[PDB]
Design a protein around this ligand. Structure first.
Ligand SMILES: NC(=O)c1ccc[n+]([C@@H]2O[C@H](COP(=O)([O-])OP(=O)(O)OC[C@H]3O[C@@H](n4cnc5c(N)ncnc54)[C@H](OP(=O)(O)O)[C@@H]3O)[C@@H](O)[C@H]2O)c1
Ligand SMILES: NC(=O)c1ccc[n+]([C@@H]2O[C@H](COP(=O)([O-])OP(=O)(O)OC[C@H]3O[C@@H](n4cnc5c(N)ncnc54)[C@H](OP(=O)(O)O)[C@@H]3O)[C@@H](O)[C@H]2O)c1
Lengths: 313, 313
């Protein structure tokens, strides 16, 4: 027997309540409303009101996304919101791995096969075969080598691209050269024909894709920003696009979302925009992950997807 | 010891001569010019003049492409051109398998992830997440189930799309439903959300993608024409694009190449054009295939890539 409280600003709350009840048939599940200070064992949340969590000795909180910068930022502003005893979990993969693979493989191949150049030629009804690019000139760098970065690297290794990754700690993936820490970032960047961002938003990574980073990339590089908008200094990117340093950028996330209509990114010729849909939260998969994790916690088994609040992700 | 004659209208003849000499060091290799009636054992050709082959009792002819409709059409007009004793080979895969996989996977995923819809929205600086498509609604049909069709099917099976193929004779690929012959074509087409053309050009397949074929596809279908332009009745395709039957078409080949500037395909909003570059002939790989095949022929080993002139491919 357990009590679960659920809160999400826009999802179908009734659907989630019914799905959780079936997946955890001993659970009593309820939508949280202001004033509800009754007991709860677990909370499933996205942009929770401070009142929902403050003072609660919960057994766990599950954030309904892969990224937790929104909740950690709220906690820094409202230290009373989550007691230090409460473990915080995020959604680990739950179908977002495959979605990131779909997006990255499609667009890496799109650029590798010069579909952007052919489109420009098509606009003028101009027929012209172009030289083939070669894999040896198309090293792919993955900024962030975690749950999603590993999946993307694996799918691209299938296509025989040279690969490198960047993280805080060394990785062991065969055939993927691992770079670690800020002291190795310039060497990492030097060969990245395509730079794929899959970092979390933390104080240590804000603004990392800036003028100084972009200048270290090879000429005619491509940027795929799949992580958070705050990683990219948008005016520095525009300057690199305008100079020809960056040949193309595909961006799924932005400093402000929805991306305001005055942003020059919308109409810039070498930019492709998607509205934070690279890997969406699928409710059924989230319910399965959460129910399995609660069961593991009850059995004293090791759990993977716990957030380290001191580290920030 | 052997004599090889080489002819190609545009490739780097001197490079090919030197590469063949190194790959087959007992071979005497020469570029063919009008008037050369000296002896030859093997001919490597693309759009050969009739005079180059007429009357020659060659041990084999190698056509420097995957498709042989150009040479077979010439032979039908000039029956003296190739003696019936001369076996005809084409390029089998030689890197074109992987190239077709790159093209098909990139674009299938592009459509599956609604990048064409997001681009339309981007053109108006409009932010709007769209519903996910689901694999169960995205059956991919491969028209032609040969060397290249099998490779494309295999790469797409990796992504868990439902798959079906169409050919003259039954296939055994696990997880790919095999349809065979014109009597089964309407059933094949009924579920194809994406139709990928990898047929050869033969009298039996000319014009197959016409009004009657397109009307049997599901609504909002996609066409990827990677094979020959003569397979598609361009005015029927335009009508299906204009009515909304076909949501998008990506075309690498056309009835006339270069595609004339008056064609409505160039500027049509849901059409993407590439200039017959889906899988190009790579010289080094072609030289390796040809030298290996000649060695197998000398040893009396079984050879795969022989054209059946009676069948037409
Ligand atoms: N639709 C979307 O666009 C979408 C959907 C899902 C997720 N996301 C984003 O993707 C992010 C990644 O998700 P994930 O599940 O892969 O996270 P994860 O498994 O926590 O991976 C994070 C990775 O980033 C690295 N990292 C963190 N701080 C770093 C630093 N200061 N220097 C170098 N590397 C650093 C970590 O290094 P270690 O391996 O050394 O710890 C780790 O490899 C989320 O945080 C979210 O923002 C976006
Ligand atoms: N850059 C380009 O755009 C590019 C590059 C390379 C090749 N191509 C094109 O791709 C074509 C395919 O190459 P490939 O190497 O895969 O050829 P292949 O191995 O000969 O495959 C041909 C396939 O088409 C099927 N087929 C032939 N006639 C048919 C009919 N009347 N009804 C039903 N199915 C029929 C065959 O059936 P069976 O299996 O029953 O014999 C076979 O599966 C070439 O002929 C060329 O035109 C284009």
């Amino acid at each position: 027997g357990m009590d679960i409280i659920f809160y999400h600003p826009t999802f179908d709350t009734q659907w989630w309540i019914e799905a959780l009840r079936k997946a955890i048939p001993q659970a009593r599940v309820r939508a949280w409303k202001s004033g509800d200070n009754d007991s709860a064992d677990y909370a499933l949340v996205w942009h929770p009101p401070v009142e929902m969590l403050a003072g609660r000795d919960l057994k766990a909180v599950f954030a309904l996304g892969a990224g937790v910068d929104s909740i950690l930022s709220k906690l820094q502003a409202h230290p009373e919101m989550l007691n230090p005893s409460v473990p915080l979990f995020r959604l680990e993969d739950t179908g977002m791995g495959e979605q990131m693979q779909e997006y990255a493989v499609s667009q890496v191949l799109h650029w590798f096969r010069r579909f952007d150049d052919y489109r420009i030629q098509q606009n003028s009804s101009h027929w012209q075969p172009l030289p083939e690019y070669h894999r040896e000139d198309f090293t792919i760098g993955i900024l962030g080598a975690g749950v999603l970065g590993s999946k993307v690297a694996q799918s691209l290794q299938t296509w025989r691209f040279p690969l490198r990754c960047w993280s805080r700690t060394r990785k062991s993936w065969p055939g993927v050269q691992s770079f670690a820490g800020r002291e190795e970032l310039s060497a990492f960047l030097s060969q990245c024909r395509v730079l794929i961002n899959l970092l979390p938003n933390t104080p240590e990574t804000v603004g990392i894709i800036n003028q100084q980073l972009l200048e270290k990339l090879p000429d005619g590089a491509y940027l795929l920003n799949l992580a958070r908008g705050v990683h990219v200094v948008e005016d520095d990117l525009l300057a690199a696009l305008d100079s020809g340093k960056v040949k193309g950028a595909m961006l799924d996330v932005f400093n402000r979302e929805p991306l305001p209509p005055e942003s020059p990114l919308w109409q810039h010729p070498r930019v492709t925009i998607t509205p934070h849909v690279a890997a969406i939260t699928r409710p059924a998969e989230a319910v399965e992950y959460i129910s399995r994790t609660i069961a593991q916690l009850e059995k004293g088994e090791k759990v993977c997807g716990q957030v380290d609040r001191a580290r920030g992700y």
